Amino acid sequence: MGWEELTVELEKDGEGLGFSLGDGGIFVSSVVPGGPAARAGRLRVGDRILEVNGVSVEGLTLEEAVKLLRSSGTTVTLTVLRERGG
Amino acid sequence: MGWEELTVELEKDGEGLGFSLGDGGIFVSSVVPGGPAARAGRLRVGDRILEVNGVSVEGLTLEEAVKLLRSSGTTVTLTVLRERGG
C-alpha cells in the first residue's frame, strides 16, 4: 500500500463545502524515557501511526490498534507520520 | 511546515516496546453526493485532514477542527493524507 499527501481546494456552494468531519485515528501518546521507542531515531510523542508491521490502522479503534500491536511479536516496524517544522 | 513519513523498527526489552497509543485526529466522515467535495479530484471518505488553509490540525479536538474550518472563509484548501492501494 501507500500514503498519498494531497491538496484539495473547495469553494462553498449554497450548502457549504459539502463534507463532514469525524474524530479518530491512532497516535503515540507517551514514550517511556530510556526505552526502545525513545532511542534516537525512533518515536516521538504525537507521531501518527499509519501501519504496524505493514498492516494499516486506517478505520481501527484504539482497542483494535492496541491489540494489533500486542499481537505483532518481539520486533515491530511502525510506519508513522510526523509533523516537522511546526 | 511539513509532513514526514518514516519507519521505526522497535525490539521489546523487559518492559516491552516502551510507548503507548492514544485515539484522536480528524478525518472526512461523509461527503455530500454532488457537492463541492465530491467533484472529481477532491475529497474521499476516510481522508485524514492534516491542514486547513495551512493551519495544522495536529493536537486539535474535533470541535477545534470544525470551528477552524467554519472560520476559514469561502474558499478552503485542505491538506490531506489518503491511503492508496489497500
PDB file of C-alpha atoms in Angstrom:
ATOM      1  CA  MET A   1       0.000   0.000   0.000  1.00  0.00           C
ATOM      2  CA  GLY A   2       0.836   3.665   0.004  1.00  0.00           C
ATOM      3  CA  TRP A   3       0.105   7.003   1.561  1.00  0.00           C
ATOM      4  CA  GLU A   4      -0.846   9.999  -0.574  1.00  0.00           C
ATOM      5  CA  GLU A   5      -0.499  13.602   0.560  1.00  0.00           C
ATOM      6  CA  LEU A   6      -2.698  15.875  -1.494  1.00  0.00           C
ATOM      7  CA  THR A   7      -4.182  19.389  -1.540  1.00  0.00           C
ATOM      8  CA  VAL A   8      -7.871  19.863  -2.259  1.00  0.00           C
ATOM      9  CA  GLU A   9      -9.255  23.354  -2.873  1.00  0.00           C
ATOM     10  CA  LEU A  10     -13.021  23.667  -2.219  1.00  0.00           C
ATOM     11  CA  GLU A  11     -15.357  26.655  -2.884  1.00  0.00           C
ATOM     12  CA  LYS A  12     -18.619  26.773  -0.878  1.00  0.00           C
ATOM     13  CA  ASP A  13     -21.950  26.386  -2.751  1.00  0.00           C
ATOM     14  CA  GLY A  14     -25.455  27.080  -1.280  1.00  0.00           C
ATOM     15  CA  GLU A  15     -24.961  24.173   1.143  1.00  0.00           C
ATOM     16  CA  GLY A  16     -21.309  24.891   2.074  1.00  0.00           C
ATOM     17  CA  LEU A  17     -18.220  22.750   1.450  1.00  0.00           C
ATOM     18  CA  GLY A  18     -20.238  19.537   1.267  1.00  0.00           C
ATOM     19  CA  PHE A  19     -18.455  17.238   3.652  1.00  0.00           C
ATOM     20  CA  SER A  20     -18.310  16.470   7.322  1.00  0.00           C
ATOM     21  CA  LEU A  21     -15.516  15.674   9.794  1.00  0.00           C
ATOM     22  CA  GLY A  22     -15.102  12.908  12.329  1.00  0.00           C
ATOM     23  CA  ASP A  23     -12.637  12.219  15.195  1.00  0.00           C
ATOM     24  CA  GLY A  24     -10.379   9.150  15.176  1.00  0.00           C
ATOM     25  CA  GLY A  25      -7.039   7.615  14.406  1.00  0.00           C
ATOM     26  CA  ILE A  26      -4.061   6.373  16.337  1.00  0.00           C
ATOM     27  CA  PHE A  27      -1.131   8.322  17.693  1.00  0.00           C
ATOM     28  CA  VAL A  28       1.766   7.945  20.065  1.00  0.00           C
ATOM     29  CA  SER A  29       0.575   9.380  23.346  1.00  0.00           C
ATOM     30  CA  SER A  30       3.664   8.742  25.550  1.00  0.00           C
ATOM     31  CA  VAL A  31       7.212   7.375  25.219  1.00  0.00           C
ATOM     32  CA  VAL A  32       8.929   5.671  28.178  1.00  0.00           C
ATOM     33  CA  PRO A  33      12.127   7.611  28.938  1.00  0.00           C
ATOM     34  CA  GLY A  34      15.188   5.490  28.251  1.00  0.00           C
ATOM     35  CA  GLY A  35      13.151   2.784  26.432  1.00  0.00           C
ATOM     36  CA  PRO A  36      13.203   1.275  22.949  1.00  0.00           C
ATOM     37  CA  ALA A  37      10.961   3.922  21.453  1.00  0.00           C
ATOM     38  CA  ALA A  38      12.902   6.764  22.977  1.00  0.00           C
ATOM     39  CA  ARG A  39      16.238   5.781  21.445  1.00  0.00           C
ATOM     40  CA  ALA A  40      17.463   8.301  18.909  1.00  0.00           C
ATOM     41  CA  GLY A  41      15.792   7.963  15.556  1.00  0.00           C
ATOM     42  CA  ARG A  42      12.695   6.232  16.903  1.00  0.00           C
ATOM     43  CA  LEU A  43       9.304   7.520  18.080  1.00  0.00           C
ATOM     44  CA  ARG A  44       8.174  10.930  19.298  1.00  0.00           C
ATOM     45  CA  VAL A  45       5.003  11.895  21.164  1.00  0.00           C
ATOM     46  CA  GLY A  46       2.267  12.891  18.666  1.00  0.00           C
ATOM     47  CA  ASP A  47       3.532  10.576  15.905  1.00  0.00           C
ATOM     48  CA  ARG A  48       0.528   9.309  13.895  1.00  0.00           C
ATOM     49  CA  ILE A  49       0.556   5.502  13.390  1.00  0.00           C
ATOM     50  CA  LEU A  50      -0.136   4.538   9.768  1.00  0.00           C
ATOM     51  CA  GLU A  51       0.886   0.831   9.805  1.00  0.00           C
ATOM     52  CA  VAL A  52       2.022  -1.848  12.239  1.00  0.00           C
ATOM     53  CA  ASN A  53       4.158  -4.490  10.509  1.00  0.00           C
ATOM     54  CA  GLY A  54       2.649  -3.394   7.240  1.00  0.00           C
ATOM     55  CA  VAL A  55      -0.959  -3.567   8.452  1.00  0.00           C
ATOM     56  CA  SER A  56      -2.836  -0.261   8.074  1.00  0.00           C
ATOM     57  CA  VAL A  57      -4.549   1.155  11.167  1.00  0.00           C
ATOM     58  CA  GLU A  58      -6.998   3.080   8.908  1.00  0.00           C
ATOM     59  CA  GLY A  59     -10.511   2.538  10.351  1.00  0.00           C
ATOM     60  CA  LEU A  60      -9.273   0.831  13.533  1.00  0.00           C
ATOM     61  CA  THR A  61     -10.484   1.788  17.018  1.00  0.00           C
ATOM     62  CA  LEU A  62      -7.876   2.326  19.708  1.00  0.00           C
ATOM     63  CA  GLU A  63      -8.581  -1.139  21.084  1.00  0.00           C
ATOM     64  CA  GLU A  64      -8.099  -2.771  17.669  1.00  0.00           C
ATOM     65  CA  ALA A  65      -4.801  -0.893  17.219  1.00  0.00           C
ATOM     66  CA  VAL A  66      -3.510  -1.757  20.685  1.00  0.00           C
ATOM     67  CA  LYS A  67      -4.433  -5.399  20.316  1.00  0.00           C
ATOM     68  CA  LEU A  68      -2.884  -5.446  16.806  1.00  0.00           C
ATOM     69  CA  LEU A  69       0.323  -4.138  18.299  1.00  0.00           C
ATOM     70  CA  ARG A  70       0.272  -6.705  21.126  1.00  0.00           C
ATOM     71  CA  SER A  71      -0.016  -9.440  18.536  1.00  0.00           C
ATOM     72  CA  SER A  72       2.876  -8.267  16.384  1.00  0.00           C
ATOM     73  CA  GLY A  73       5.757 -10.134  18.028  1.00  0.00           C
ATOM     74  CA  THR A  74       9.112  -9.290  19.519  1.00  0.00           C
ATOM     75  CA  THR A  75      10.094  -6.868  16.746  1.00  0.00           C
ATOM     76  CA  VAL A  76       7.683  -4.293  15.456  1.00  0.00           C
ATOM     77  CA  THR A  77       8.034  -1.997  12.479  1.00  0.00           C
ATOM     78  CA  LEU A  78       5.833   1.058  12.626  1.00  0.00           C
ATOM     79  CA  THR A  79       5.073   3.344   9.698  1.00  0.00           C
ATOM     80  CA  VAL A  80       4.354   6.757  11.107  1.00  0.00           C
ATOM     81  CA  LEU A  81       3.541  10.312  10.054  1.00  0.00           C
ATOM     82  CA  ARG A  82       5.337  13.100  11.998  1.00  0.00           C
ATOM     83  CA  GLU A  83       4.673  16.891  11.641  1.00  0.00           C
ATOM     84  CA  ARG A  84       8.003  18.746  11.092  1.00  0.00           C
ATOM     85  CA  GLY A  85       8.763  22.441  11.129  1.00  0.00           C
ATOM     86  CA  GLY A  86       5.727  23.473  13.198  1.00  0.00           C
TER      87      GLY A  86
ATOM     88  CA  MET B   1       5.645  23.090   7.768  1.00  0.00           C
ATOM     89  CA  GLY B   2       5.971  19.563   6.509  1.00  0.00           C
ATOM     90  CA  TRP B   3       4.853  16.006   6.949  1.00  0.00           C
ATOM     91  CA  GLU B   4       7.372  13.196   7.392  1.00  0.00           C
ATOM     92  CA  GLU B   5       6.613   9.544   6.703  1.00  0.00           C
ATOM     93  CA  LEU B   6       9.076   7.302   8.471  1.00  0.00           C
ATOM     94  CA  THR B   7       9.626   3.677   9.524  1.00  0.00           C
ATOM     95  CA  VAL B   8      10.694   2.893  13.074  1.00  0.00           C
ATOM     96  CA  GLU B   9      11.796  -0.632  13.992  1.00  0.00           C
ATOM     97  CA  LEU B  10      11.492  -1.428  17.731  1.00  0.00           C
ATOM     98  CA  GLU B  11      12.669  -4.554  19.648  1.00  0.00           C
ATOM     99  CA  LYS B  12      10.963  -5.261  23.004  1.00  0.00           C
ATOM    100  CA  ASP B  13      13.050  -5.022  26.220  1.00  0.00           C
ATOM    101  CA  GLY B  14      11.957  -6.261  29.713  1.00  0.00           C
ATOM    102  CA  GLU B  15       9.199  -3.623  29.733  1.00  0.00           C
ATOM    103  CA  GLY B  16       8.054  -4.044  26.095  1.00  0.00           C
ATOM    104  CA  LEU B  17       8.185  -1.521  23.244  1.00  0.00           C
ATOM    105  CA  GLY B  18       8.183   1.452  25.608  1.00  0.00           C
ATOM    106  CA  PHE B  19       5.423   3.636  24.277  1.00  0.00           C
ATOM    107  CA  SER B  20       1.692   3.978  24.479  1.00  0.00           C
ATOM    108  CA  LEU B  21      -1.073   4.778  21.976  1.00  0.00           C
ATOM    109  CA  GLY B  22      -3.920   7.255  22.066  1.00  0.00           C
ATOM    110  CA  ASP B  23      -7.037   7.866  19.904  1.00  0.00           C
ATOM    111  CA  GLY B  24      -7.538  11.144  18.027  1.00  0.00           C
ATOM    112  CA  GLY B  25      -7.218  13.114  14.845  1.00  0.00           C
ATOM    113  CA  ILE B  26      -9.511  14.437  12.175  1.00  0.00           C
ATOM    114  CA  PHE B  27     -10.883  12.672   9.137  1.00  0.00           C
ATOM    115  CA  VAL B  28     -13.512  13.082   6.476  1.00  0.00           C
ATOM    116  CA  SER B  29     -16.508  11.149   7.715  1.00  0.00           C
ATOM    117  CA  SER B  30     -19.015  11.856   4.883  1.00  0.00           C
ATOM    118  CA  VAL B  31     -19.127  13.631   1.506  1.00  0.00           C
ATOM    119  CA  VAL B  32     -22.386  15.152   0.210  1.00  0.00           C
ATOM    120  CA  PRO B  33     -23.190  13.497  -3.133  1.00  0.00           C
ATOM    121  CA  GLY B  34     -22.993  16.004  -5.963  1.00  0.00           C
ATOM    122  CA  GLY B  35     -21.318  18.667  -3.754  1.00  0.00           C
ATOM    123  CA  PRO B  36     -18.037  20.572  -3.869  1.00  0.00           C
ATOM    124  CA  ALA B  37     -16.082  17.890  -2.063  1.00  0.00           C
ATOM    125  CA  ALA B  38     -17.442  15.117  -4.214  1.00  0.00           C
ATOM    126  CA  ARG B  39     -16.306  16.631  -7.510  1.00  0.00           C
ATOM    127  CA  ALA B  40     -13.620  14.576  -9.196  1.00  0.00           C
ATOM    128  CA  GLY B  41     -10.197  15.121  -7.734  1.00  0.00           C
ATOM    129  CA  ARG B  42     -11.465  16.334  -4.368  1.00  0.00           C
ATOM    130  CA  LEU B  43     -12.212  14.555  -1.079  1.00  0.00           C
ATOM    131  CA  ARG B  44     -12.954  10.923  -0.276  1.00  0.00           C
ATOM    132  CA  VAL B  45     -14.437   9.406   2.881  1.00  0.00           C
ATOM    133  CA  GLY B  46     -11.628   8.418   5.302  1.00  0.00           C
ATOM    134  CA  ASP B  47      -9.250  11.166   4.129  1.00  0.00           C
ATOM    135  CA  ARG B  48      -7.149  12.325   7.114  1.00  0.00           C
ATOM    136  CA  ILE B  49      -7.066  16.145   7.499  1.00  0.00           C
ATOM    137  CA  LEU B  50      -3.526  17.448   8.047  1.00  0.00           C
ATOM    138  CA  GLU B  51      -4.051  21.214   7.473  1.00  0.00           C
ATOM    139  CA  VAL B  52      -6.847  23.696   6.831  1.00  0.00           C
ATOM    140  CA  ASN B  53      -5.597  26.739   4.906  1.00  0.00           C
ATOM    141  CA  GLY B  54      -2.114  25.878   6.045  1.00  0.00           C
ATOM    142  CA  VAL B  55      -3.038  25.513   9.724  1.00  0.00           C
ATOM    143  CA  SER B  56      -2.148  22.090  11.169  1.00  0.00           C
ATOM    144  CA  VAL B  57      -4.917  20.142  12.914  1.00  0.00           C
ATOM    145  CA  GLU B  58      -2.268  18.241  14.957  1.00  0.00           C
ATOM    146  CA  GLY B  59      -3.468  18.223  18.600  1.00  0.00           C
ATOM    147  CA  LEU B  60      -6.907  19.669  17.796  1.00  0.00           C
ATOM    148  CA  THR B  61     -10.157  18.182  19.124  1.00  0.00           C
ATOM    149  CA  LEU B  62     -12.977  17.619  16.664  1.00  0.00           C
ATOM    150  CA  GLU B  63     -14.660  20.801  17.865  1.00  0.00           C
ATOM    151  CA  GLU B  64     -11.494  22.866  17.343  1.00  0.00           C
ATOM    152  CA  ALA B  65     -11.115  21.424  13.824  1.00  0.00           C
ATOM    153  CA  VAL B  66     -14.749  22.011  12.886  1.00  0.00           C
ATOM    154  CA  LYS B  67     -14.704  25.548  14.203  1.00  0.00           C
ATOM    155  CA  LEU B  68     -11.359  26.176  12.431  1.00  0.00           C
ATOM    156  CA  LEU B  69     -12.960  25.058   9.204  1.00  0.00           C
ATOM    157  CA  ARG B  70     -16.035  27.254   9.752  1.00  0.00           C
ATOM    158  CA  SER B  71     -13.745  30.227  10.180  1.00  0.00           C
ATOM    159  CA  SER B  72     -11.723  29.637   7.028  1.00  0.00           C
ATOM    160  CA  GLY B  73     -13.791  31.601   4.507  1.00  0.00           C
ATOM    161  CA  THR B  74     -15.452  30.957   1.188  1.00  0.00           C
ATOM    162  CA  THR B  75     -12.522  29.000  -0.263  1.00  0.00           C
ATOM    163  CA  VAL B  76     -10.765  26.347   1.734  1.00  0.00           C
ATOM    164  CA  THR B  77      -7.595  24.469   0.910  1.00  0.00           C
ATOM    165  CA  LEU B  78      -7.227  21.197   2.741  1.00  0.00           C
ATOM    166  CA  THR B  79      -4.015  19.202   3.023  1.00  0.00           C
ATOM    167  CA  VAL B  80      -4.980  15.589   3.431  1.00  0.00           C
ATOM    168  CA  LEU B  81      -3.483  12.115   3.745  1.00  0.00           C
ATOM    169  CA  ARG B  82      -5.252   9.330   1.773  1.00  0.00           C
ATOM    170  CA  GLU B  83      -4.432   5.558   1.961  1.00  0.00           C
ATOM    171  CA  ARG B  84      -3.960   4.155  -1.595  1.00  0.00           C
ATOM    172  CA  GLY B  85      -3.657   0.586  -2.779  1.00  0.00           C
ATOM    173  CA  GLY B  86      -5.344  -1.007   0.251  1.00  0.00           C
TER     174      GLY B  86
END
